[PDB]
Amino acid sequence: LLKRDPLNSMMNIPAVLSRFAGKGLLLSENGYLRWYVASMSIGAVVVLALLMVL
Amino acid sequence: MIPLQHGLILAAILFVLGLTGLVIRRNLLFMLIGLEIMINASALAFVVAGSYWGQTDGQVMYILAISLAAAEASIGLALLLQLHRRRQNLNIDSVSEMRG
Amino acid sequence: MTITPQNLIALLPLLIVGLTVVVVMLSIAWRRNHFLNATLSVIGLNAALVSLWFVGQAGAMDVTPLMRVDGFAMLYTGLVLLASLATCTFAYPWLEGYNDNKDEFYLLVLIAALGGILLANANHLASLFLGIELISLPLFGLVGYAFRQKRSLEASIKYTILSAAASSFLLFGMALVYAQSGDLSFVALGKNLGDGMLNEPLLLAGFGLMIVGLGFKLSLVPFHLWTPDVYQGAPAPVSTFLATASKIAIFGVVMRLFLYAPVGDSEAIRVVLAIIAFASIIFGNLMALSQTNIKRLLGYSSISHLGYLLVALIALQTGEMSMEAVGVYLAGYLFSSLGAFGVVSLMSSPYRGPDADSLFSYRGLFWHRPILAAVMTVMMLSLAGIPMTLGFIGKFYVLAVGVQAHLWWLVGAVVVGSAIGLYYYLRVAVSLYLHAPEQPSNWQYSAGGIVVLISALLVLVLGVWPQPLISIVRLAMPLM
Amino acid sequence: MEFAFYICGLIAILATLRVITHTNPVHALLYLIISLLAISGVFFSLGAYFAGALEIIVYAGAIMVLFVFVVMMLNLSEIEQERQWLKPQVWIGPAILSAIMLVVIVYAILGVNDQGIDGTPISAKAVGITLFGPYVLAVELASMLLLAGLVVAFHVGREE
Amino acid sequence: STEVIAHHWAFAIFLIVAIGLCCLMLVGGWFLGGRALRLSAKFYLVAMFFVIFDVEALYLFAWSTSIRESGWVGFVEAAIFIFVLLAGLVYLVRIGALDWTP
Ligand SMILES: CCCCCCCCCCCCCCCCCC(=O)OC[C@H](COP(=O)(O)OCCN)OC(=O)CCCCCCCCCCCCCCCCC
Numbered sequence: 001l002l003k004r005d006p007l008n009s010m011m012n013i014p015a016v017l018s019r020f021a022g023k024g025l026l027l028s029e030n031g032y033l034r035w036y037v038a039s040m041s042i043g044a045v046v047v048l049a050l051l052m053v054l
Numbered sequence: 055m056i057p058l059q060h061g062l063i064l065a066a067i068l069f070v071l072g073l074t075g076l077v078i079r080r081n082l083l084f085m086l087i088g089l090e091i092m093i094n095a096s097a098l099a100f101v102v103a104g105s106y107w108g109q110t111d112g113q114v115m116y117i118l119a120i121s122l123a124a125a126e127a128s129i130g131l132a133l134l135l136q137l138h139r140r141r142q143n144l145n146i147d148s149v150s151e152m153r154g
Numbered sequence: 155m156t157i158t159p160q161n162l163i164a165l166l167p168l169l170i171v172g173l174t175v176v177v178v179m180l181s182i183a184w185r186r187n188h189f190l191n192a193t194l195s196v197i198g199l200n201a202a203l204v205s206l207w208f209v210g211q212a213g214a215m216d217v218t219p220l221m222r223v224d225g226f227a228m229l230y231t232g233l234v235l236l237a238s239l240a241t242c243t244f245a246y247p248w249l250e251g252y253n254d255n256k257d258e259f260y261l262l263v264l265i266a267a268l269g270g271i272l273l274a275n276a277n278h279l280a281s282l283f284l285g286i287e288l289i290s291l292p293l294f295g296l297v298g299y300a301f302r303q304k305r306s307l308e309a310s311i312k313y314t315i316l317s318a319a320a321s322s323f324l325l326f327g328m329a330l331v332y333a334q335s336g337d338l339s340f341v342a343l344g345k346n347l348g349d350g351m352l353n354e355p356l357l358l359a360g361f362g363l364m365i366v367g368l369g370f371k372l373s374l375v376p377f378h379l380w381t382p383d384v385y386q387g388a389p390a391p392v393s394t395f396l397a398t399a400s401k402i403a404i405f406g407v408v409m410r411l412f413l414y415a416p417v418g419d420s421e422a423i424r425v426v427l428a429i430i431a432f433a434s435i436i437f438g439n440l441m442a443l444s445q446t447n448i449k450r451l452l453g454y455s456s457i458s459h460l461g462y463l464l465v466a467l468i469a470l471q472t473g474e475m476s477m478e479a480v481g482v483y484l485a486g487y488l489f490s491s492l493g494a495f496g497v498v499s500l501m502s503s504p505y506r507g508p509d510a511d512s513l514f515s516y517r518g519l520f521w522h523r524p525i526l527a528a529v530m531t532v533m534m535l536s537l538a539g540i541p542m543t544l545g546f547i548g549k550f551y552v553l554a555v556g557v558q559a560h561l562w563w564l565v566g567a568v569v570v571g572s573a574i575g576l577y578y579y580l581r582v583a584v585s586l587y588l589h590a591p592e593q594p595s596n597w598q599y600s601a602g603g604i605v606v607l608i609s610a611l612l613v614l615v616l617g618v619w620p621q622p623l624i625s626i627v628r629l630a631m632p633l634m
Numbered sequence: 635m636e637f638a639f640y641i642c643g644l645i646a647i648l649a650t651l652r653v654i655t656h657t658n659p660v661h662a663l664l665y666l667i668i669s670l671l672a673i674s675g676v677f678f679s680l681g682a683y684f685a686g687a688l689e690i691i692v693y694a695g696a697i698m699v700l701f702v703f704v705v706m707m708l709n710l711s712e713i714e715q716e717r718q719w720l721k722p723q724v725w726i727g728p729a730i731l732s733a734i735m736l737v738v739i740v741y742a743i744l745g746v747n748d749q750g751i752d753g754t755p756i757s758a759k760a761v762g763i764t765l766f767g768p769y770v771l772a773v774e775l776a777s778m779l780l781l782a783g784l785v786v787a788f789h790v791g792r793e794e
Numbered sequence: 795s796t797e798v799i800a801h802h803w804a805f806a807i808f809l810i811v812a813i814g815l816c817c818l819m820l821v822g823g824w825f826l827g828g829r830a831l832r833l834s835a836k837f838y839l840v841a842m843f844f845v846i847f848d849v850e851a852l853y854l855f856a857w858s859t860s861i862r863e864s865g866w867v868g869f870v871e872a873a874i875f876i877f878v879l880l881a882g883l884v885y886l887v888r889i890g891a892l893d894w895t896p
């Protein structure tokens with residue numbers, strides 16, 4: 001049961017999570033200029049709302 | 055007896071209208087038009103702020119704003135001319151090759 | 155106010171770079187000579203760099219209601235001038251293969267360096283705005299200098315549109331800030347507020363819009379999506395300048411703004427900047443995990459390193475060594491990025507036509523370019539924060555500043571992002587030292603090689619012995 | 635002076651709304667010129683006489699002239715045959731985002747101290763005094779910025 | 795004041811009567827009477843040069859109305875501004891940017 005070294009895989013789980021998160025984040029880099037402007041305006045909305053709340 | 059709030063509200067309305075025109079339009083010419091609207095709205099906001107405080111600083115910043123606006127309009131229209139010369143269309147979604 | 159001759163002495167790099175712009179202009183008007191115009195540009199930049207000594211002997215005080223010249227401004231002017239000189243040195247062999255006019259490149263580099271000096275000496279919202287535009291618009295020209303190439307034109311269009319949008323956002327922010335405070339000087343932003351009413355809604359909104367513009371300019375999340383595309387599409391010396399000098403000057407003027415403005419101590423702005431720094435570090439490291447191309451990898455690297463810088467900036471009001479940390483980190487980041495982008499520029503030079511690919515192919519570089527591979531792997535170890543390198547000294551400074559101010563979320567972010575950076579930087583290094591299936595001769599190419607070699611030597615020497623850099627950064631202390 | 639300010643602001647808002655929703659580029663530029671004239675009227679109502687004069691002279695007399703020149707150059711072409719921006723699946727999202735940002739900015743505006751803009755006319759003499767006084771380097775480096783834009787636009791906008 | 799509001803009303807009446815005159819002229823013209831290529835980039839270049847030098851002209855417009863109040867140092871500053879303007883103009887002439895002929 002232990003010959004696959006389960007603790008090694010459990011500690012390799014963060015590497016898999018980092019790979020999945022990087023692949024998910026790279027979907028934002030689609031290369032569309034209109035999406036870049038939209039993301040800048042979305043970030044402006046988020047920054048303004050966070051400053052208004054706090 | 056003209057409120058500063060009303061002038062800033064008008065400038066904000068024009069700014070978000072220019073931003074909406076910049077986002078929703080795929081034509082690069084309308085994107086440049088929207089950019090001109092946003093920078094003119096920011097310059098109007100500076101003029102309103104300078105007129106509220108009775109200072110010439112708002113008009114000085116307006117002058118700097120329109121110097122920037124003229125120069126970026128020139129650069130953006132040259133880029134638009136090159137894009138129309140080498141692509142024969144102004145669809146900004148077509149130029150999306152580098153990604154990821 | 156009036157301008158004294160001592161004020162003109164304190165404005166010596168500005169006047170020298172502007173006179174160099176005029177002289178290079180008239181030399182191009184006389185006769186298009188690539189070598190003579192490049193020589194005049196580098197002579198003017200070196201003259202400004204050595205006139206920094208006369209600026210230091212002048213003193214530290216207020217040249218304008220707009221500029222304040224202090225040791226901070228001297229250090230940032232020196233970093234900007236060094237980056238511009240390295241950009242010209244890398245640009246000459248790349249422009250040797252350029253078939254259109256080559257002389258406009260150095261004029262644009264000179265105007266961008268002038269904007270960097272403006273941002274270094276800026277003490278006013280007008281100066282901040284004009285310095286940002288004076289940096290960005292020559293960058294509009296330089297990013298699409300090879301506009302016949304499809305990727306360079308695409309990067310120019312993206313950078314121009316997004317930077318005009320960010321300039322409008324920033325300008326609206328200064329408009330709201332001026333409507334609140336009534337003064338455009340840095341020291342008078344939120345000065346009229348009192349009794350714990352520092353979080354004025356209009357002032358916070360204007361500072362938020364300025365944060366949007368500057369966070370575009372600093373490649374901070376979520377205004378970061380332009381960075382790998384513009385870095386990849388631009389020419390490699392342009393990518394060198396855009397990675398080093400623009401980031402350094404804009405972060406220096408942001409440091410001045412948050413140091414001088416009483417509203418820089420606001421809790422809400424601090425939390426917003428902490429969120430931006432956390433997301434910037436994590437996102438910039440995560441997106442560079444699977445990047446085959448070196449330019450996009452360096453763009454995500456720039457995002458993460460600016461996140462570390464932002465972490466150092468958040469503790470500006472808490473620790474007095476935050477300016478020390480920012481200066482040491484920026485010197486290390488400047489030299490590492492100069493080395494990496496100079497290796498890319500030297501292996502991308504001369505410009506092999508607009509219709510051909512500009513792919514790097516760093517695999518097996520040691521077996522035909524051993525010194526370039528050694529410099530490039532030194533820079534990749536330096537950007538990872540590995541000891542014996544100056545990037546480690548900067549990251550140690552960032553960690554010390556975060557620990558002193560109890561920014562534990564940011565400290566954990568730096569550790570996690572450092573591990574992810576270790577992965578992809580070591581991947582680049584071993585790919586350099588692997589084997590490749592398949593795949594100069596002038597003194598300017600050798601000059602670029604010398605520049606990247608002294609950059610690597612500086613990184614190693616100041617990694618094992620950083621105390622001279624610490625002393626020269628401690629000498630760069632501003633007005634209180 | 636109040637009535638002129640409000641009617642010019644209303645005309646500018648309506649003209650900008652017609653600009654960002656139109657199809658014909660020349661018509662959009664014409665409503666943009668109308669909006670610039672309206673914002674110049676706003677400037678004149680607030681006592682910023684030099685700013686309104688430059689708004690008609692430079693913004694509505696040079697920059698939009700350049701836009702009109704480029705539009706005539708293009709002879710504008712798969713634009714009116716698409717009309718994609720008026721389909722709601724394209725424009726509802728960004729309109730919602732802009733409305734949210736406008737609401738946040740307006741809420742920040744409404745919480746400020748207002749003594750009212752008196753509209754005292756600020757002449758171009760005072761603007762020229764402060765332009766070559768406290769803002770010397772602004773003028774010089776703005777000349778350099780215009781030079782940078784000139785060089786960049788000449789380098790890009792050629793034909794060879 | 796009464797004089798300034800009289801001048802404001804005179805200017806308003808001037809504008810309204812001029813607009814009404816030309817509109818009524820066009821209306822009378824319409825009513826009366828029975829019924830029965832790729833341009834060269836030099837246009838963009840000259841318009842762009844006009845825009846840039848018109849902004850520089852606006853800076854000189856602001857300077858010219860307050861020359862006495864600026865003193866000799868204002869003259870030196872504007873001389874530097876005009877020298878940079880003329881260096882840019884010489885640069886444009888010498889590279890054939892302002893030469894319409896080839
Ligand atoms: C994935 C890897 C990265 C992991 C994340 C990065 C590190 C996270 C560290 C979290 C620290 C949480 C601290 C919680 C309490 C903070 C507020 C407080 O009460 O602080 C106490 C004290 C300040 O109050 P003072 O009056 O100065 O008292 C002097 C104390 N002798 O505070 C002090 O004097 C200084 C307190 C310092 C506490 C230790 C910080 C570093 C500890 C080692 C690393 C974290 C633990 C090991 C790894 C965990 C799992 C990853």
Ligand SMILES: CCCCCCCCCCCCCCCCCCCC
Pocket residue numbers: 527528529531532535540541542543587
């Ligand atoms: C830790 C700080 C940096 C230390 C130096 C890093 C390496 C720099 C380059 C030195 C020369 C490398 C030579 C490698 C030869 C590999 C041969 C492999 C044969 C299979």
Ligand SMILES: CCCCCCCCCCCCCCCCCCCC
Pocket residue numbers: 032034035038042045147727728730731
């Ligand atoms: C072919 C590719 C086209 C890409 C077009 C991208 C358009 C982006 C539009 C974004 C709309 C956002 C709407 C609001 C979202 C919720 C509010 C912001 C987040 C809290």
